[PDB]
Subunit: 431 residues, 4 copies
C-alpha cells in the first residue's frame, strides 16, 4: 500500500516543499506510458513525467545506452572532449535549420536559458531582456527575471532591465482594431511602450513558440515573423525557448520550423534529455565567434559530460528512425478529435488548442461567457487520478483552468483512447 | 590517434566555446583514477573530472545502481514521490548535523545555490547578498551575482544588493593589527563598511568553507564562528556552499563539522552526484516551515527525480561503508608530505595548503618575495599532461598560479606516488 | 546690439551646453509680458519665461516683497522657523482641497517630486513607481527615472522598479473597443501588464493633470478618478505633479479641483515661485504622521527659507485678490478662439487643445492624415521670434510638433491679440 | 514672545516634518552674524544659517544687487542668455584653476551633484559611482545614492552600481601598516575590493575635500592626489563637491587649491549663493565638448536665471575685494586657538580639527579612551542656545558627537570671542 507510514513520516520530516502538493501515492516503477503505485496500480502518464519523457519511461534503448556509458565514460574535466559530445553537437547543427551551427551542452532548462541570455548580453553589450507576460523560463536568476506566469513576488527585485509584453491570446482577445483582434497591431503597440521605457539597452527577446505553463498559448500566424522583425530593427537577438516544444512534440522537429523563422539562439532541454538532465543551446557560427572573441564564459561541472550527451544522441536517433515526429501528428490528431467530442458532450470545455501532442483544454463555467470554472478543474483532476490517469492543470488570473496534455511520442492508439475515456468519466463524476 | 581530423573538424564547426581551451586529445574511456585517450594512453586524473568523481570513474556500484533504475524508475512528474527520493533526503538529514533537517534535490551546483538564495530572500523578506571577493558559486544569475573570482565584466549589471568582502588569506595577509594579521579585525572592518552601504536589506552571506576556485583558501581558525555571529547579529542567514568540500573530501563528512558551526542552509552538488548531475540544499525545519507558509517555490523538471536520487544514496553508502572520509585523511596526508618534499627541492613552490584531499600548491617566482610566477604555471601544467597527469591551475590577480589537487577518495597509495613523481618531473623539465 | 562679440566669445568659452540652443540675442531687461533684447526690442513672452512667471516679469508686488525680506530675513538654519514659512504652509493647506494639510517648502520642481517619491516609498515600504510614457518630472535621479518624454538613453540604468503606461491621447487614439477609443479600457489593459510585471512593490503613480512637455495632453473625463481607484486598489499613492498646472493657470486654483479627485501628495513649483525658486509638496496629515513616525528625512539647505517663502505668499495673495484664476478663463477663452480662427485659415494646424491659459497647437502636414509636419514647426518658431513673439515647440515621435502657449495670468487683451497676429504672420511667411 | 500659540498651532498642523526638530523660537529678523527671536534676543549664528551665509545675513551689497535685479531681469526662458549669467560663468572659469573652463548654473547642492553625476555617466558611457562611507551629497536620487552618512534605510534600493569606501580618519584610525596608520595603503586596499566588485562600469568618484556632515573630516596629506591617480588609472572622473568648502571658507578660494589637485568636475552651491539658491558645476572644455556631442541634457526651470546669477557674481566680488579668503585664515586661527584653550580646560573635548573657518570639535567621554560622550553633546548644544549661541552637532556611529563651527567670513574678532565665551559657559553648566 501507498500508506507506508514510515515513508510518509520521513517525507513530512525531511523534505523541503517547493511548490504544489505531493500526490498521495508512492511510485514504485514506471514503463512506457505508465507509472505504478505501491499497490501496483497503473497510472496513464499524460504529461510524460514533468513534460520530458518523449520516448516514455524506461525506453529500452535509452536503458542500453545508459548502461553502456555508465560503465565506460561517465563524467570528465570540462576541458576534455569525447565523441558523444562531438556527435551530439554535430547532430544538432544538422537537424536544426540553417543558421544554427554551434552547440553548448548543459544540464537544465533554466541553465540553458541563462547561457543564452548571458551570451546575448555579451555580444550586444546591452542588458535589457523582454519576454511574455505569461512566460516561464526557469527558477534561476535571469531565467526567473524573465518568467512572468508566476514566482515574481516576495523574493526581492528582479534583474535590472526586465520587461514583458502581453502574449497574443486568440481565445481571450483584448486588443481590437476595426472590430477585429489585431494581434500584430497589439505587438506594435506593445513595442512602442517598450521603446519608450528602454534605457537604450535592449539585448534580446526570449520566447516560447507555445506558452506552456502560460496555458498552452500558440503564437498565431505571422506573429513570430513580425516579432523577429521588431527585434532585428532594434538590434536585439531572438531566443526561442523550445524546452517543451522541441524534438517532435508539436509535429515538426522544432516548432520554429513551422513558421519558417529561425531564432538567433535556440534552447532545448526537457524532451532532449527525455527524462535525464541534459540541455542545450544552439546558435549561429557568427554569434558564437563574436561571443568567443569577447570572452564568453559559461563553465560548469557537467557541461560536455559524456553520459548525458550519449543519452541525447540516442533519443534523436530513435525519433528519427521511428518517424516519431510524424507519429506526433497522427496521435495528436487522434487525441484532438476526442477532445473535441468531449467538448460536444460537456459545456464546461471552453476550448481545445495546441499542436501535435502538446494540447490544452481550457475549463470554463459556460462556453458563452467563457467564465473561469473555479474548483471544477481541481475536481476533475482528482477524479482523473482516482480513475488512473495522471493530469495537470494550470490556472492563471483571468483565464479558466487549463489541462496540459502531453503524452509520450510513443503513446499507442489504445492508450489514447483509454485516457480519453478516463477523462470523460472524470468529467462526468465531477459535475 | 587523437588526431581524428573529422573529429576535430566537427569540434571546430559545431561547439560553442565556453571558457578555457579544449585539451588536444580524445577521451575514449575512463576507469577508477584514470582516463584514456584515443591512443589508449592512461592519464592520472588528479582533479576527479571536474572535481566531482569522489568514487573515481565508473565505479562498479554506481554502475549497478544506475543500471537498476534506468530500467525501473527513471523520471517523474515533480509532484510524485518515490523511495530513493525519500531515502536520500532522510539520509541527508541524518548525516548532517543537528539543525539540518529537510532537503531539496536538484541537479546542479548553481541551481542549488539559487534555491538557497531564493529561500533566504523569501524568509527574511530582504534581498541583499554578501559573498567573498574570490568566490565562485555558479554561472546562473544569482549564483553569478555572488561569484567574484571571475565573470563579472561585460554581461550587464549584477543583481541589486550584491556585496563582497575580502576572504581571510593567511598566505598573502593585507590587514594588520599590532604587527599581526588580524583576520578577525579584518572581518569587523569589512562589515562595518557593509553596514554602512546596506539599504537595510541584508538577507544572507554565502560562503565556501575552502575557496576552491579562489585558490584553495581555507578559512582560518575561528573565522567561521565569528562570521556566523556577524550574520546572526544582523538577522542574516548563513549559506555554506559545500559543492567541493562535502561528502568526505576534506577529511570530515562536511567541512562545517570541523569548525563546529552549522549554517542555516547547506548546499551540495559535485561530490554528491559523484559525476552525475545531482545537487541539494539542506535546511532546518523552522526555516523550511516558514518558507512554506510564505509560498516558497522552486519547481523544476528534475527536482525529485528518482534515478539521480538513487545514485546519490549509493554514493553515501559507499563512503560510509568504506570509511572513505578517514581514507581522505590518510591519503591526504600521504599526498601533502610529498608536496612538501617537492617544495624542499624547488624554489618555485611557495605554499602547500588545503585539507584532506583538497590541496593547493601555489607557484611562485621566489619563496622570499612570493612573487607570482607568470607562465611557469602553464608550463608545468603542459608538461604534466605530456607525462600523463591531469592537473588544473587557477590564476588570480595578485596571487601566484595555484594547482588544485583533488584525486578520488578511492585513490591508491601507488596512484599518489605516481602523480607525485610525474609532478616532480614536470617541474624539472619546465624550469 | 545683440552682437557683442566679447559677450558671445565668453558664452562660447565658458558655458556648459545643457539642451537646446541659445537664442541669438542678449536679454537686457524684462517687464510684464515682455522681455527686451540689447537693441531694446520687445519680445512678447508667450511662455512666461520657462512656464513660471504667472504674474509676468518684475511684478511690482513681488519686487516689494523681495526687497523687504532680502533686507530683513534671508536664509536660516533649516531647523529654525519664521512667519513667512508658517503662513505659507497654512495658506497652502487652506486653498487646497480637504485632505491636503501639511506642506514642505523646497526649491525646485524635481526636488519637490523627489521628496514626494521618497515619502511614498517610506510610508508604503515599497519602491516601484509608475508614470506616463510621455511625462516629465525632472532631471534628478528619481524624478528622471519617472520621466519618459525624453532623457532616458546613455546615462546608465534607471531606478529599479520604474514603469510607464501610455497616457490617454484623444487626438491620436490607439486603443479601440467597439469602434471607439476606450481610454478607460486602455487604462485597464495597461495595469494588467503592470500587475504582471510588479515584484509586488507598487508604491505610487506620479502624474501631471495635463502633460505639458508631453504635448499638452489633457487627461480626459473620468480618467483621473478611474486612475485613483487603480491605485487605491493596489495600495499605491497618487502623486500629482502640478508644477505647470497649479496656481490658476488652467482656470482653477489647481487642476485636480476640476476632476474633483484629490491626490495623496500634491507637488508645486514653477508658478508657485513665479520665477523664483520655490517649490512644495502638500500631503494629508495621516500620511505626514506616518512618514514622521518612520523617520522621514528630507533635509536641505533651503528648505524653509524665509525669503522665498515670502515671495510665494505674496504670489498667492495677488492671485486671489485679483481674481486671476477667473481671468485665466476669460483670456484663455479669448486666446483659444483666436487659435481656432487660425486653424480655419491654415491647414497645418491640426489641433488646439488645453485649458485656461495652458494651450497647445499641434502642427500637422494635413488635417486629414494628421501627418507630422517636420521642419515646418521650427520655421514658424523662427519667424515668430523675428516678429517679436517668443514661442516654444515640443516634438515627440509619432506626433506633430506642438506649440506650448502659456502667457502670464496678467496678460492683457491687447497682448493676446498681438500675439495672435504675430503668429498668423509667422505661419504665413513660413509656408 | 516666542510663545505665539496661533503660530505654534499652525506649525503643528501644517508643516511636514523633515528631519531633526524645530527650535522653539520664532526668528523675526537677521543681520550680520546674528539672528533675532521674537523677544528681540540676538543669537550668534555660528553656522552661517544652514552653512551658507558667508557674507552674513542681509549683507548690504547682496541686498542692493537683489533689489536691482528683482526689478529689472528676473527669470527667463532657459534658452535665453543675459549678462549676469555670462559674467558669472566667466568669472568662475577665471578663479578656478586651469582645467576648469565651463560652467552650468543651477539652484541647489544636490541638483549640482546630479548634473555632475549625469555628465560623468554620459561621457564615460559607464554608471558605477563611488563615494565615501560618511559622505553627504544631497537628498535627490543619485545624490542620495552616493550619500552614506545617513538616509539609506527604508526608502527602497539605491541606484545600481553604488559603492562606498572608508574615508581616511586620522583621529580614529582603523588600518595599520607597521604600527602606523597608513591611510594610503587603506586606499589601495579599498580599491582592490572595488575593482573586484565592479561590473567594469566605473564612471566617477565623488568626494568632499572635508567631510562636513561626516564629522569635519579632512582628507590627509597626499590622499587626494593619490585618489585622483586611482581614478585616472581606472578611466574614472573625479567630482569634488565643494558646497561647504568653496568660496573661501577653508582659507583658499577652493579647497582643491590646497592640495594642488584639480578635479574633473567641481560642484558648488551653499556659499556660492550665500543664502540664496544658486549652485553650479564647473568642468573642463574637453569634457564639456564631449558631453555636448553626446547630447548632454540638464534642462531646468531655473538654470541660467539672471537674478540668482547676479547675486553669485556680487558675492564673488565682495570676497575678492575684501580679502575674505585671507580673513578666513586669520579669524579661523583666532577661533582655533580658543577651541584649543577650551580643550585644555575640559576633558570632554577630544579633538579640534578643520581648516580656516570650517572647524569641528569632537566631544568625548575621556581623552584617553576617546569614548563617545552620549547625551553630553546634546546638553551643551541646548545650553549654547539658552546662552544665545547657535550651534550644530552631528553624531555618527563609532564617533563622538561633533560640533560643526562655521561662522560667516565677515565675522568680527568680538563675535569670535563672544562665541568662545558662550561655549565655555555652556560646557561648564552642562557637565
Ligand atoms: C570554478 C568553476 C567550477 C566549475 N566550480 C563550480 C562551482 C559551483 C557550480 O557548479 P555548477 O553549476 O557548475 O555545476 C558552485 N559552487 C562552487 C564552490 C563551485 O566551485 P570548478 O571549481 O569545478 O572548476
Ligand atoms: C512551468 C514549470 C515547468 C517545470 N517548466 C519548466 C520550463 C523551463 C525550466 O526547466 P527546468 O530548469 O525546470 O528544468 C524552461 N522553459 C520552459 C518553457 C519551461 O516550461 P513545467 O512546464 O514542466 O511544469
Ligand atoms: C548634511 C546636510 C546639509 C543640509 N548638507 C547638504 C549638502 C549638499 C546638499 O545641498 P542641498 O541640496 O541640500 O542644498 C551637497 N553637498 C554637501 C557636501 C552637503 O553637506 P548640511 O551639512 O548643511 O547640514
Ligand atoms: C519639460 C522641461 C521643463 C523645464 N519642465 C520641468 C518640469 C519639472 C521640473 O522642474 P525643474 O526642476 O526643472 O525646476 C517638474 N514637473 C513638470 C511637469 C515639468 O514640466 P519645461 O516644461 O518648463 O520646459
Ligand atoms: K564536464
Ligand atoms: K521530477
Ligand atoms: K533653511
Ligand atoms: K531659466
Ligand atoms: Na542547423
Ligand atoms: Na542533520
Ligand atoms: Na487643503
Ligand atoms: Na579655471
Amino acid at each position: 500500500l501507498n500508506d507506508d507510514a514510515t515513508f510518509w513520516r520521513n517525507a513530512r520530516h525531511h523534505l523541503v516543499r517547493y511548490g504544489g502538493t505531493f500526490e498521495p501515492m508512492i511510485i514504485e516503477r514506471a514503463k512506457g506510458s505508465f507509472v505504478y503505485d505501491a499497490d501496483g496500480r497503473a497510472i496513464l502518464d499524460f504529461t510524460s513525467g514533468q513534460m520530458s519523457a518523449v520516448l516514455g519511461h524506461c525506453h529500452p534503448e535509452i536503458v542500453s545506452v545508459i548502461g553502456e556509458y555508465a560503465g565506460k565514460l561517465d563524467h570528465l574535466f570540462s576541458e576534455m572532449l569525447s565523441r558523444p559530445v562531438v556527435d551530439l553537437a554535430t547532430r544538432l547543427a544538422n537537424i536544426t535549420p540553417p543558421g544554427l551551427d554551434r552547440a553548448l551542452l548543459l544540464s537544465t532548462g533554466a541553465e540553458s536559458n541563462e547561457a543564452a541570455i548571458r551570451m546575448a548580453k555579451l555580444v550586444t553589450g546591452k542588458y535589457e531582456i523582454v519576454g511574455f507576460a505569461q512566460s516561464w523560463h526557469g527558477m534561476t536568476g535571469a531565467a526567473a527575471s524573465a518568467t512572468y506566469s508566476a514566482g515574481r513576488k516576495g523574493v526581492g527585485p528582479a534583474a535590472v532591465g526586465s520587461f514583458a509584453i502581453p502574449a497574443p491570446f486568440t481565445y481571450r482577445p483584448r486588443f481590437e482594431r476595426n472590430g477585429a483582434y489585431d494581434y500584430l497591431a497589439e505587438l506594435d503597440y506593445a513595442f512602442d511602450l517598450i521603446d519608450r521605457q528602454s534605457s537604450g539597452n535592449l539585448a534580446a527577446f526570449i520566447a516560447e513558440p507555445i506558452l506552456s505553463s502560460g496555458g498552452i498559448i500558440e503564437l498565431p500566424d505571422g506573429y513570430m515573423a513580425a516579432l523577429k522583425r521588431k527585434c532585428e530593427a532594434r538590434g536585439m537577438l531572438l531566443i526561442l525557448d523550445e524546452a517543451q516544444t522541441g524534438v517532435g512534440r508539436t509535429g515538426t522537429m522544432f516548432a520554429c520550423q513551422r513558421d519558417g523563422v529561425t531564432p538567433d539562439i535556440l534552447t532545448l532541454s526537457k524532451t532532449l534529455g527525455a527524462g535525464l538532465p541534459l540541455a542545450a543551446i544552439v546558435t549561429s557560427a557568427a554569434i558564437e565567434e563574436r561571443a568567443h572573441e569577447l570572452g564568453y564564459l559559461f563553465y560548469t561541472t557537467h557541461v560536455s559530460d559524456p553520459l548525458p550527451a550519449a543519452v541525447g544522441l540516442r533519443v534523436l536517433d530513435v525519433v528519427q528512425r521511428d518517424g516519431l515526429v510524424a507519429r506526433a501528428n497522427v496521435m495528436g490528431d487522434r487525441l484532438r478529435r476526442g477532445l473535441l467530442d468531449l467538448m460536444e458532450r460537456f459545456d464546461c470545455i471552453g476550448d481545445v488548442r495546441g499542436r501535435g501532442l502538446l494540447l490544452g483544454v481550457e475549463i470554463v463555467k459556460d462556453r458563452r461567457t467563457k467564465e473561469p470554472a473555479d474548483g471544477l478543474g481541481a475536481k476533475i483532476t482528482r477524479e482523473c487520478m482516482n480513475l488512473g490517469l495522471s493530469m495537470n492543470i494550470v490556472q492563471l488570473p483571468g483565464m479558466g483552468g487549463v489541462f496540459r496534455i502531453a503524452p509520450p511520442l510513443t503513446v499507442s492508439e489504445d492508450e489514447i483512447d483509454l485516457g480519453l475515456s478516463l477523462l470523460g468519466q472524470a468529467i462526468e463524476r465531477a459535475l
